[model samples]
Target: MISLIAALAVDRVIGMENAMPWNLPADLAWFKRNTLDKPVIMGRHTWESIGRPLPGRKNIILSSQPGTDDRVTWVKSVDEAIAACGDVPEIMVIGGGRVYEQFLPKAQKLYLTHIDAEVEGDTHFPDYEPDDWESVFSEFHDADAQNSHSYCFEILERR
Candidate 1:
């Protein structure tokens, strides 16, 4: 999976629970811009949090046991998700922590939002060595009138 994670905090805290507490408009914009019109892969819990299909995109939910949602296309395993990806050229594995960990090593790319503060959270991104991927591009957005916080967007290419 081409895992693109938009995360905050120096520690890459994704969530404290099933949902995100911080409402970052910038990140939402980023997610909408990038994920539109594409097949997005996410775990069962992540799907539950959203509670429905995300409009303007194909929501592909990956789980060991498929859920009942006509709007969602469920895959029973990580391999099924991988197989469904096929030659689509690009696929997104949006996460809950377990999903990220299961696919991180196989990911070809990563998009991370590096927030400038430390947050107390129960969930985190998959830990990896910097040398395994190369930073291709990055853009920094400072806490501004519109955004309540500062963060950097970085795109990393697997080496």
Candidate 2:
């Protein structure tokens, strides 16, 4: 199984300056808890943006380039990342835009935090046919002192 997780605006804007424009602790917590033990396949650009590998999960980087890190496995493409997931029950596609573009078609599930406010973004999440999937779960969260915008967390599965 394959899944993708992201936080984006209605226009699908997801990144600006290598980071998300909004801050939602609830969303972050949901992300962390769900991806905790999965093997996450991320792009090199995303890897660089994060500056470190996620803990408690197998970090696989899709990069033609090289990096010496014992914590993560570096691979070249989407196929290679899929092959690398070998024993993992599911592959989680954690993104920075282009990475999601390559895997979204094949993803079976999606974890998205759709924020109500739009902000600056150099990249946006890939577009998918809304009719092709059905939401299995969703919850709305209001903006608070810690969160910059109100958002809805949705889990959609391919129909």
Candidate 3:
């Protein structure tokens, strides 16, 4: 399975100033739980924002520039990244807008954290046909001392 994972605001904003505009603990936990031990593919900007390769997972970066890193496999294209993953049952596309857009067509599932608040952001999740997919799982979380906003973890699979 190829899964696209992201957290977006009510208005579909995913990033602001090259970083997430809000932090929700539950959302972070959900992301980790789902992507852990799975091959994770991300863009160069996303990798830079994250600062390092995610532990216990194969970290692949999509970049046009040449590079070498002991922690990551740098691929010039999405197809290369997927091919590098070999036969993994699932590969999680963790993103920064453009990467998500490129993989959206091939994605089989979407793991999204839908936040309740509208936010100011420059990057947005790509639009998709709602009728083409169906929600397979969901869990809502309310804003609290630990979480920054009310949000729901929704898993949508292609129908």
- Listed in order, each prediction's TM-score against the native is 0.92, 0.95, 0.97
Q: Model 1, range 1-159, lDDT digits (tens) per residue?
A: 476666757677888778665767888888887788777889898999998788977788887764688777889888888777667767877898889898888888998878776667888888877999999989998898777789888889999
The segments of candidate 1 whose C-alpha lies over 4 angstroms from its true place after superposition are none
Model 2: runs farther than 4 Å from truth? none
**What C-alpha lDDT, on a 0 to 100 scale, does residue 57 get in candidate 1?**
72
Number of the predicted model whose lDDT against the real structure is largest: 3
Model 2: ten consecutive residues of lowest lDDT: 62-71
- For residues 6-95, write the lDDT of model 3, one tens digit per residue: 998977899998899887878888989999999999989988898888998999999999966867899998889999999999999999
The true-versus-predicted C-alpha distance at residue 50 of model 2, in Å, is 1.6
Worst 10 residues of 1 by lDDT: 1-10
Q: Candidate 1 — which pairs collide?
A: none
Question: Each candidate: what lDDT?
Answer: 0.80, 0.88, 0.91
Global lDDT of model 3:
0.91
What's every prediction's RMSD, in angstroms?
1.5, 1.2, 0.9
What's the true lDDT of residue 38 in model 1? 72
| Candidates in descending TM-score order | 3, 2, 1
How many angstroms is residue 126 displaced in model 2 relative to the true structure, after the best TM-score fit?
Answer: 0.6
Better of 2 and 3 by lDDT: 3
